[PDB]
Amino acid sequence: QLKMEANIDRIKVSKAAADLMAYCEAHAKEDPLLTPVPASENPFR
Amino acid sequence: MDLPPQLSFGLYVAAFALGFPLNVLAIRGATAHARLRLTPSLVYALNLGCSDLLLTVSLPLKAVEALASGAWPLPASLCPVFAVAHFFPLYAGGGFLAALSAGRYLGAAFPLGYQAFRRPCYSWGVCAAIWALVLCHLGLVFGLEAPGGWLDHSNTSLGINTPVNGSPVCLEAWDPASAGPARFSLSLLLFFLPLAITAFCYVGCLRALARSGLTHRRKLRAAWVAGGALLTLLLCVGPYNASNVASFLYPNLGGSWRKLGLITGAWSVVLNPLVTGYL
Amino acid sequence: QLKNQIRDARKACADATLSQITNNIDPVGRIQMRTRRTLRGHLAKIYAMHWGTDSRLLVSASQDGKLIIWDSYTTNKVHAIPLRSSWVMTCAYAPSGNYVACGGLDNICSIYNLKTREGNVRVSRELAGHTGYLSCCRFLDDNQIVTSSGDTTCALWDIETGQQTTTFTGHTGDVMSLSLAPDTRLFVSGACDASAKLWDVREGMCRQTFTGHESDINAICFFPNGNAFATGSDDATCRLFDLRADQELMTYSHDNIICGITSVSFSKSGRLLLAGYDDFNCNVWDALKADRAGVLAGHDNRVSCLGVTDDGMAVATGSWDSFLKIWN
Amino acid sequence: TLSAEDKAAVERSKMIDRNLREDGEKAAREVKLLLLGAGESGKCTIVKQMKITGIVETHFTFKDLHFKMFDVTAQRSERKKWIHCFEGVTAIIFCVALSDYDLVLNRMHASMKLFDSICNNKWFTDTSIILFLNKKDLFEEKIKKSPLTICYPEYAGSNTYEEAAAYIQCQFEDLNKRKDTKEIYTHFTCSTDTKNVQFVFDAVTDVIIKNNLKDCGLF
Ligand SMILES: CC/C=C\C/C=C/C/C=C\C/C=C\C/C=C/C/C=C\CCC(=O)O
């Protein structure tokens, strides 16, 4: 199993970090936690 | 050898100024403990804290009247209110202590039954019953004995009795051999029976602990707490009832004995939270 | 030899750290959350919770011997299943909402059918075959469930068949938690050997293993993207691991915190993650800057578990006291 | 609650809440015990005396009191992971095989180590623990046949049953650092059925008395 684990394809850490940053910034508006939600339509308030 | 009015005023002010912060701290601690969980002992602690706060509220009038020119430096309209506010807590504390001792005895001598009947509703009901009984007894005695009642003289004032001149405070210059039996009955029914119940529950709890196989440290701590509570109740209530029964037995009592009894009763509000404050 | 080659490959791929890439990002300001709803139906310590697909109904299992499904919008209770065994430490909610699973000291992931013709909840299946305490149960589909036990192994079960089909082995320590990818094709398991292994639903073998933790892992959760996950161990640290990079990206720790971590979850966008702690406090860490954003100190004993809804409207944190809080 | 569905939901919630309150009231007075052992002592002989996976559940009522005993001998995993689950139990029943001192897995040393580990747990400080010593006759036969010096080289003296039992009890009892807030009810298992249940009931009654005193404020 260790030999199979060793023989894998790995990408650069910088590219993966950039992809994660792009995903985080793309969905920042959709996240209701980063941007406070008004109580007018908030189900919990 | 009556105490000078200045010393009495100073000791009253000191007692109030020490009791009030301790009383409010104990009340806050009891409320905080009850917020997390409600226990039967917490109900009694809250009732005792409320009675202590009421006694502190009533204290300043007595403190200002303790002076030489302090016969009655207040309107007579609220004199019965002050008399009730000063007399009720003295017996209320003893009743609460007796109820707490009874609960401890029931929980120690009969553990299975007490656990099966662990209900704060019963504690609230018994507390309400004690409050109602004490209030009814005080009201009936005030109606029957104090001037202005059905059996009192028509030409009299409610809580005011100055056959010579001036105007004294309520129960400050009570006529001898007038409400002697009534005061004696109140003292008995409000302290002696609760004292006997507390002593019986204390000895029963001690016997149960001795028969128990618990740790010696726990038994010693419980015995010390119970003994301290009993000593507090004695040193805070007993002298006043002893003075009352001595006056009832023969009217030869008179002078500084009543002042000493009132001072000892006032020491209750400042000494009780030291042993039972739940800080 | 192979381990040395793997370590060398991991070291070579580490071109730069996550902090350098995220340096140019404007830091997020402090966020304050208030308990909108409080649930007090439970009378004992709770151990697990799981939100529904519609982000309205959640299920919580407590130690008194039963689990209650809560309608968080109205706070009223809609169901109460008396569990056969009082010792329960995990619970799950089906994506369709029809089934609810639970497990504990007894090696059974009992499944209950919420929707019944008679209108009364009944037990649909009783899965057996584990020899250790059931750490977690999770639903893949309406007929597939993945359970992790204390026998250092995980298994995939079939509801209709009633017997496990594929089993996963290789963990040195007892498995404590697991999380499912959004596509429900691969998953990880957090064992007590301070390692996390990436498994397969279909064929079932560990492609990759992740190490670096100094203590046993108690919580794990995938990134919303699905290409990364975060782990929570007992040494007061959270490490973000990358499947493609096969190495730790960023660590979340501080000198003030020394207590262990019970539950770890991500937000809707994954920018911030909420991690439970043994000091009844929840720290809202930053997934890109390792900077705290807020503290949820609304609990009393210890934050047993916490979860975030699919749409991310609110986060619910369970705890060892009888009260459950909904934070928004 | 103008809508009929809202009223129905509120009524269902109230019914569920009242059922929860009733269940909590029923379980408040119910007594739970935990059974622990080392090696072959996990399968306690109390259930066998009563007769003649995962947690094993046993129910028996003595003197109109319900007792629940849990067997953890089938939980062959890390104890610390699930030890916090067994919190708030009335007492912990510990059984030690006195005849296992000669046998080597060392069995007595393992039992002492496990007792020390469970007694020093932060979650078991308040919970009382009951110590049971089994096979007293077998232990006395073994010490009559084989010397006891092998198990305890430091211990010296005669080879009678009384002093050996006293020494074993003292060595088991002195394994806790907190001797003030923790109490151990050591006992020797005998063929009489009534003695064991009487001792367990006495320990449970003592725990109940302590809990009542703590609730009333005498702690
Ligand atoms: C003026 C007050 C004088 C006496 C006041 C109350 C007195 C005596 C009450 C009880 C003792 C003996 C028997 C009745 C059983 C009673 C239940 C009362 C209390 C325990 C409640 C608790 O603490 O949990």
Side-chain angles (χ1 to χ4, degrees), chain B residues 40-41 44 91 95 98-100 102-104 106 114 123 126 130 133-134 189-190 193-194 197:
Chain B
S41 190
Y44 300 122
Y91 320 115
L100 184 58
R104 291 165 164 166
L106 287 161
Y114 186 82
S123 176
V126 75
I130 296 169
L133 189 151
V134 174
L189 193 140
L190 289 158
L193 169 72
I197 294 302

Side-chain angles (χ1 to χ4, degrees), chain B residues 193-217:
Chain B
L193 169 72
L195 190 67
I197 294 302
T198 311
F200 169 67
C201 295
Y202 169 82
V203 73
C205 193
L206 265 293
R207 283 165 71 250
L209 280 188
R211 293 197 274 101
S212 177
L214 275 167
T215 300
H216 192 52
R217 212 269 306 161

